[PDB]
Amino acid sequence: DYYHATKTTIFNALLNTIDLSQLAQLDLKQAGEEIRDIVAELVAIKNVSMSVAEQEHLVQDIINDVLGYGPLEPLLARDDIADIMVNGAHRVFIEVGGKVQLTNVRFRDNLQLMNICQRIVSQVGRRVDESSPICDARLPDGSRVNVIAPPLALDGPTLTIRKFKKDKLTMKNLVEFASISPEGARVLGVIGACRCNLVISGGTGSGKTTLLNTMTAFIDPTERVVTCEDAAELQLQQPHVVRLETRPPNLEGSGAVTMRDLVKNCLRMRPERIIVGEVRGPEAFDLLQAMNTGHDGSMGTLHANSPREAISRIESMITMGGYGLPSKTIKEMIVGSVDVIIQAARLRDGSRRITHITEVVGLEGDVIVTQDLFVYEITGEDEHGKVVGKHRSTGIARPRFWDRARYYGLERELAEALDAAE
Amino acid sequence: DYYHATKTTIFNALLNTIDLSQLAQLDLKQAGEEIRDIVAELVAIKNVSMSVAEQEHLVQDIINDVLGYGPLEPLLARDDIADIMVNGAHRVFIEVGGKVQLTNVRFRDNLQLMNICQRIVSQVGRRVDESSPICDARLPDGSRVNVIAPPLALDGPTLTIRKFKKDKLTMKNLVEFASISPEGARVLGVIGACRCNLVISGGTGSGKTTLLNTMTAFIDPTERVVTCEDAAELQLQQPHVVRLETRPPNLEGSGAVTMRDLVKNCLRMRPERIIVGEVRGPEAFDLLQAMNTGHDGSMGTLHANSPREAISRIESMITMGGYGLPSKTIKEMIVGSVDVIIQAARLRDGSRRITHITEVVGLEGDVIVTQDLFVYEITGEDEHGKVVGKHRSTGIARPRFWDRARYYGLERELAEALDAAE
Amino acid sequence: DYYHATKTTIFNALLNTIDLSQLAQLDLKQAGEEIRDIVAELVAIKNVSMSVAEQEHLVQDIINDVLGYGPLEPLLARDDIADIMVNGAHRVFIEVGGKVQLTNVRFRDNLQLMNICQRIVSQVGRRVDESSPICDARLPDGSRVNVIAPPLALDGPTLTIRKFKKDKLTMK
C-alpha cells in the first residue's frame, strides 16, 4: 500500500540514473528492461522489503510515467471506458455504460499531467503548451484527443480522450432508430455508392453532420475523398482521405482561410469526391463546379427545411458570392450539378428522421422541378406526443440518376429497394 | 510645500538624464533599482539630500510615474475607494462612502495622463489613441476600465476605473429583494433544472452575471459543465465544472484566444452544458450550434435591453461573424436553438428586477414570434422614490419547453408555478 | 534494418557537420562529391559492414534526403508514375495506368515532408509556411504542384504532384 512512498523515493534517482533524452530515443523493449533493472537496483540500494507484486506494479508504473501515459494506461486500455476526461491533476471521470462516473485515479501535479498530455498529443506530432494552449488531435487508432493548457483552463491542464466506436453512426443505427426504412437504407446505399452528387439539407437540430458521416461510409475505399470542414467533425474510415480545416482571421483580420479557399484548392488537388462539412457561403458556387468538373459523387450539408428551400438557399448563397450571375444561370448550374437532395428534420417529439429523398430532374420556366423518390408521411401520434409516420416510395421506377446505378451494377438493387418500399 | 517642487525638479533632471527606453528592458524591481541609481547620478549634479523617510518616498513617487500608474497608485491601493474617475490631468474624483468627492490629487499634463491610460489598457493588450480613441477593458485585478482619448474628450483624456465587488447572490436574495416573485423562483428552478437553452439578456448594471450564477446553481451535479468567461466572473458549486478563460493578445498581437476559439473547443470536449460569461462577438453563432447540436441546457449572457432587442443583437452578431448566412437561416437557427430568454434590467430607482421571462415560440415570415411567461408591471413610485411593481404570469398553461419538463418529471412544479403566478 | 539506423546517424552527423549555407551555395554535383566522401568516412568510423554498391546507394540516399527531394525523388524520376499524392508523411499514393495505388515508401516525419515541400516549391520561387498554408505552382518541367500546410491539413502536409500529361486533350 505504501509502495507509492517508495516510488517517491526512487523517482528522483531515475533521472539521476539515465537522462530522459536517452530513453526518449528508443521505443523498443530495451528501454523497459533497462528501467526495470534500474528500479530493481534502486530498490536494493534502498533496502526495502516491499511486496514482490507491489514491486512489479511499481516498476510498471514507473516505466509508464517515464515513457508511457502514466496512470491513464489502465483506463486507456480498458475497452468498456468509452470516454476519459481529466480536469486538473486531481480529478478524473470516465463515461462507462453511457454515464459519467468519477474515478480515484490522480496525478502528482499539473506538471505530470502536462507532460503526459504533451506526450499523448506529440505521438501524432502536434504541439501543446502555454504558447499554443489549445490542441486537438486524432490518433491513428481513431480516438480523438483534446487538450487545453493551464493558461486557459484555470484549474490546470484539461484533457479529453474519446475512443472510436465503429457501430455508432452506421446506416444500421439509422434503421434501428426508425429514421429511415430498410428500403430507404437500400436506396441510400445505392445513391452513395454510385457517386451521385449529394446535398444533405437539414433543419436545425436535424443532425445533418451525422447523416453525412453515415452516408460517406458507402464510398469505395479507393476513392480519394477530400473533406473541407469549418470544424473537423467528420470521421471517415476509408483508407484514403484528406482532411482539411478552415482558419479564421487573426485579430488583425489577416491570415484567414475561408471554406471557399479550401474548395478552390481542392479543385486542383485531384480528388474523386469533395465532402464539404457545411456549405455556408459563396463556397457553394465552387462546390457546384466540383460537381460538374468531373468530381462526381461530392457531398455537402446545408441548412434548409425542405428540398425546394435548400435549392433557394443555394441560389441565394451563390448570389451573395458577388459573381455576376443571373438567376437563370444559377438555377441551370444547380440543376446540372446536384443529383439528389436529402432532407433531415427534427420532429415535434424531438426525434429526427429523413423526411425527403428527392431527385432534381431539371429546369422549366426558371423553376427547378424536383421529384421525391422517398417521402416520410405522418400518420398519427401517441398520448406521449410522439409523432408516428411511414416512409413511402413515390413509385418512380426510373429516377434520372438510374444510369449511374446501372453503370456501377446496382440497378437491380435500386429497383428492388424502390419497389419493395411501397 | 518644498516636497512637490523638489520632486518636479528631480523628475525634470531624471528625464533630461535618461528616457523610458533606457529601462524598458528591466523588470519592475530592476527598473526601480536602476531608477535609484539614476537618482543618485542626478543628485550628483543637483546635490539634493533629505531624510531617508522622505528621500525614499520621493524616489518611490518618481518610480510610480516613471513605470507605474502615476499618482493613481496611492488611490488604487485603497479599499474604501469604490470608483476612480479622471476628467483631465487637472481633475480627479473618487467615490467614498457611496458618494463622489473631489480630491487634491492631480496630474502633470494631459500627455502624462494619456500615457498612464495607455499603460493601464495595454495591461490587457488594449490600445487607446487617436486611431481608436475609445477603449474599454477589464483589469484582471478585479476592475473595469474605460478610457476616451483627446479627439473625443475635449478636456483631455478621460478615465474611469470601477473596482470589483463580490456579489455572488443566491436565489433567496433575489426573492427577498423582490427581483423575482416566489412563483418566478419555482419557474426559474424548473427551467434551469430542465436543460432548456437559456439566454440571460440584461441591461447595463442589471447584474446579468450574478443572475447567471444563481441560475446555474440549479444545474444537476452530474452534468459536465464547461464555462467560458473572462477573469473568472462566475463561481459554480458543481463537482464537475471546467473553468476556461480567454487570453488577450500580448502587445505583439499574438497568443490571443478569443471566445470563438474557446466555444469551438468546448464543442469538442463532450460537455453536457456550455456556459458563456458574456456573448459580445461572433462566438454567438458557435454558441447557438452548441445550443442545438445536443448539449441541451447551455446558457449565455448577453447585453440587451429587451428580449426582442436581444434577439436582434444575436442576429446581428451572427451576421457580422463573416458567414454568408441568409437572414432567414439565422432566424430559424435562433428559433430552433433558444428556448428561453430572461431579461434583467435596472429600473429608474436603481434596483435590479427580472422584467421578462419569455420563450421563443417560432418564426412567422421574417419575425420571431415569442410569448412572455412572466412580465413585471410597474404601477407608481413610493414615498422614497422606490419603484412599485409586481410580477404577473401571462397564464400560458403549456410553454413550448413543456416536453422537457415531462422528460425530467417537473410538469407538476411548472404547472403550479405558472397557475399561481398572478 | 541496420542500414536505416546507420543512415539516420549519418544524416544527423552531416546536419551537424556544416551550416546549411555551405550546402545551399554549393552546386548539386559539388556538394554531392563531398557528401559522398563524408558518408564514406562516417561509415568507416562506424565500421558498418556494407558493400561498395551499398555504400553508393547510401550516399545517394543521404544526398537526396539532405539536399534532394528525399524518398519522394525515386517516384518523380519514374515515367509510368503520372500523379503522386502524399497525405502526410505516412501515406503515399501513385497514379499508374489510370489507377491509384498506395506505395510503401513513406517519409521520416511530417517535418521532413514540410521541408521537402518547401524545397519543391522553391524552384518556382514560391514559399509555403504556416502563414501562407496553401501553395500552388507549375514547375518549369510542366508538372503541377499543390501543397497544404499542417495548420490546414489536419494530418500533415498534402503534397500533390501532377506530371505533365502531354497530348492529353489535343484535338485527336
Author numbering:
A (entry chain B), B (entry chain A): 80 to 501
C (entry chain C): 80 to 251
Which sentences did the original study use to describe this structure?
The ATPase CpaF in C. crescentus is the only Tad motor reported to date that is known to be bifunctional, facilitating both pilus extension and retraction at the flagellar pole through ATP hydrolysis. CpaF oligomerization is mediated by interactions between the NTD of one chain and the CAD of an adjacent chain. From these data, we propose that CpaF uses a clockwise, rotary mechanism of catalysis to assemble a right-handed, helical Tad pilus, a process broadly applicable to other single motor systems.
Thirty-six percent of the hexameric particles contributed to the reconstruction of the closed state, while 64% adopted the compact state. Nucleotide densities were not observed in the cryo-EM maps. Closed state particles were no longer observed upon the addition of nucleotides, suggesting this is strictly an apo conformation. Lowering the threshold of the sharpened map, however, revealed residual density in the active site, which potentially fit a diphosphate. Due to this ambiguity, coupled with the ATP-bound configuration, we designated these two chains as ATP*. The closed state of CpaF, harboring two ATP* and four Apo chains, is only observed in the absence of exogenous nucleotides, suggesting that this conformation likely does not participate in processive catalysis. In addition, the spatial position of the 3HBs in the closed state indicates that association with the platform proteins is unlikely.
